[PDB]
Amino acid sequence: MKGDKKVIQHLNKILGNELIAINQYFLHSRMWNDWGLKRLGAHEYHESIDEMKHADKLIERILFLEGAPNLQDLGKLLIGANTQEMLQCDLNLELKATKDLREAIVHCEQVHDYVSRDLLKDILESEEEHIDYLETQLGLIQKVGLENYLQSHMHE
Amino acid sequence: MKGDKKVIQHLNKILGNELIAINQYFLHSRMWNDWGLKRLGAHEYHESIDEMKHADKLIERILFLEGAPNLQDLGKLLIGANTQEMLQCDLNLELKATKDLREAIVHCEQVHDYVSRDLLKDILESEEEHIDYLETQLGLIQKVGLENYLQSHMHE
Amino acid sequence: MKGDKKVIQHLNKILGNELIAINQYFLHSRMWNDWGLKRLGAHEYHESIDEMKHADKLIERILFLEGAPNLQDLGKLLIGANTQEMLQCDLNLELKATKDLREAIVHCEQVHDYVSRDLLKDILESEEEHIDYLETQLGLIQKVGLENYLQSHMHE
Amino acid sequence: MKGDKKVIQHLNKILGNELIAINQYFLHSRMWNDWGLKRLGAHEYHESIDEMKHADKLIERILFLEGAPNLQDLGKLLIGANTQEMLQCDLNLELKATKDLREAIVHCEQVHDYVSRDLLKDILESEEEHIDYLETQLGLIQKVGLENYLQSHMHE
Amino acid sequence: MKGDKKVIQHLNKILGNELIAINQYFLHSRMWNDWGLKRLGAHEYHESIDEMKHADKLIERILFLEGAPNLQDLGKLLIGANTQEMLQCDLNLELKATKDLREAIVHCEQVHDYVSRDLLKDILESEEEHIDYLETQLGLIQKVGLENYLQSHMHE
């Protein structure tokens, strides 16, 4: 079904953001596992998987709309060097992702692509849940102290 | 455990090949599903998942060896425009992948990294199984005709 | 129990025929599997196993009759280059096998070895069932066309 | 996938050794059953089946590598006349088999056919287990005496 | 259904042989049990039962053919004094039984009593299996020695 050209551009932009997140979260996950912080590693693995599922839905929508999904252009991964940096890197990425999602939804509404809007709203809900998680973890580091926070994430 | 610098370079090169294949196969899978060739779509999805699992093991090994996994540099995806081209694109990618795997195993043997060698041999066995599948499909197109071959891949 | 010398010769001849067929059908099976014609590969494997079972019973009977089973002399395998040739090669072998089975039964009847006759009759029934299968496949190639026939034998 | 010509020659040589062993062990099995030494008959049957399984894997690998499996040439079966001779005949065959397996592995390593090497290594491990069994039986004949050894192999 | 007079005579001759065997095997069974060779006793009991079942089928066939089954004339039991002689007595009886069975089958074929032939062929197969057992036991006495052979038949 012939989609709106700018909608497809927006969908490819969100897809690009999800592709960055998949790799960033997968690497952070395996870094945490390497360090023995297995609870963080497992949670971050599930965040990566959730981004993979969003990327799948975007690819499927783009193809239905007769566009070309762009899996070639990978933007900058924000890789941290320690737990605090990794959480903040994920939060920085998520804040950029939600800004782009909001702009995409505006355009979908303008051209009456209500189904693409609905898909993007669902993704935005998931990304805001991730922001909640990240903000909460950074707050816990301050409340319980870093050593305790890391201790609480050694075991699954 | 401090690994050999060139082994880590080889492991990152294999990882880069797996990252290309993940995206290439995932996109091909969703293209075939879009076209209603659901048996091809499902098989290619499983091929993509298999490459994800190999990428995971490479990342884990690189981190154990105190190297930095490179998920940032994504090489050229070989995306075809019809079934015949897509299968050949996958085969071309796989033949490059096995070349690099053999060169990596040579070096692991030379520096006595026998555990990395074993991991790479297991990946190589999977990639050769993929080559067998691809060669077989291209042969079947010749034996049964393209229209019958596609028909046989409509339903799961 | 001391058997008739010419009976034992006949049983060793039939055994020789079964040993050809085991290997011919096993190789044809694995050729079909290599080509992705898995329904033909599976059926042909079961034909090979059935011949293995006949060979076992012949070996056991020869030994009971105090003869020496000959598993050393392997006659000519008739290996085809494509599906049509392979089926016809199997049929040519089977027609020779049934000729020899009938001559063996004649001699068993003449010297009153009724138990060996019964064993050979059961083998003959199986070989005639295989001829039926082979004639039917060759006829189906004519009726549905080669490409359709092969397509129908891709999936098990 | 086009294999190395000498690798394929080596694989066909190992296949030829497996085909001898299939027939030698099957006949030895049925001889032991004929004599009422059913525990030896059963064990030797399982040795024959194991060689059949190796032969299958070799045939499959040769076909993948675009070679022609040779099931036509059958080398010399070493058939004993009593239990001690039959066990030594099996051992003699196995020692030749392991020599050829090592030479095939050397060549596979030299041309970087690491998957064929791994297959041959697995077969070699099975053959060394068979050697262990055979040496152990011959040793038990010495330790418990021939009559006791045979008595212990009457019943399954 | 009025049968052929000579067929009925042959069936009564075979029945007479089965009646000798029932009693000879039953007595041997109970002699072996009395001596504490319970494995021989149980096997010989099952041989006696098998002859009882053959006698039943012969009686049934004779009555159908409107003949008079002869259960009155019992021929000479071959009773041994020790295990070796008892086995040889059974073998001697079985070799007479198979000679008579072959002669009966010849006549059934001549007069086209194909159902009686088939019954007799099934009995003949059973009697040859018994010959196999007996020859095997006598061979095992030679291979493992009498004392070990008897030891192996103390316990069921």
Add this chain to the structure above:
Amino acid sequence: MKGDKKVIQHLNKILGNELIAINQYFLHSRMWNDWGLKRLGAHEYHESIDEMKHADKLIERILFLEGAPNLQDLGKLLIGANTQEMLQCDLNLELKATKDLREAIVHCEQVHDYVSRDLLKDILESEEEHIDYLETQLGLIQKVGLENYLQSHMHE
């Protein structure tokens, strides 16, 4: 089966290393249990058991190769006085063990003892997994602090 003298010497050296580790890990396990650090005690017990299983396989291989397993020579146990020292003692032992394993594999490859090589490679994988565990624990002591690290290992 007559093995290579230097292979057997290497296998006995690896065996000697495993015998040190059994006792060192078992004592460290029971020291941690005595101190109430039951999670460390249990994990270290399982490390000891894993070394026992490796020692068993080496003994079995040496005997198969007609060598004399050396369980008499016990090298120096590295026993620590506190958790930090005990982990470093285990790591020091493991790094010696992997050096010896690589040297043994080199020699096995040179003389074509591919089955002994494969055994040693499997042991090497296990020992590298143990190095990963140890390096990770030492890293966690730095990241969460010694008191938290010990607290986290009080309860199973």
Add this chain to the structure above:
Amino acid sequence: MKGDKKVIQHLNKILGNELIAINQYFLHSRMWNDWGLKRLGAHEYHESIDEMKHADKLIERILFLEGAPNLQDLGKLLIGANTQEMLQCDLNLELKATKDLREAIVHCEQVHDYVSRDLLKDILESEEEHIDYLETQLGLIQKVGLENYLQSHMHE
């Protein structure tokens, strides 16, 4: 709990005896398995495991009493060259072990370490049961003959 220094010395002496027995019995077990005497191999394996359990309890008691368990000073293994010698080696080791256990119990009683006495009494009961097993085996070799004794220990 501060234990008596001489008690701790006695406990380390008993521990040293158990450590010899662990290794002696494990090696004898694997020697019997290599020779095909699998019933002896299994039984001796269980004897080795039982000694491992006693060693564990001694280590635990030493640590509770604030002593240093000595797993370093391995005494002389008594390794036989055949079944008869191996059994007598085990018996010689056990007779030394019970002598030392009795001397340790005397001292525990004298200083009122009744819990250590009870542990040693339980170990002594186990060691006397092993003596019973060993004396019985040596007696059976005399009563049934060596070849029969070994035959009875081929199969588990």
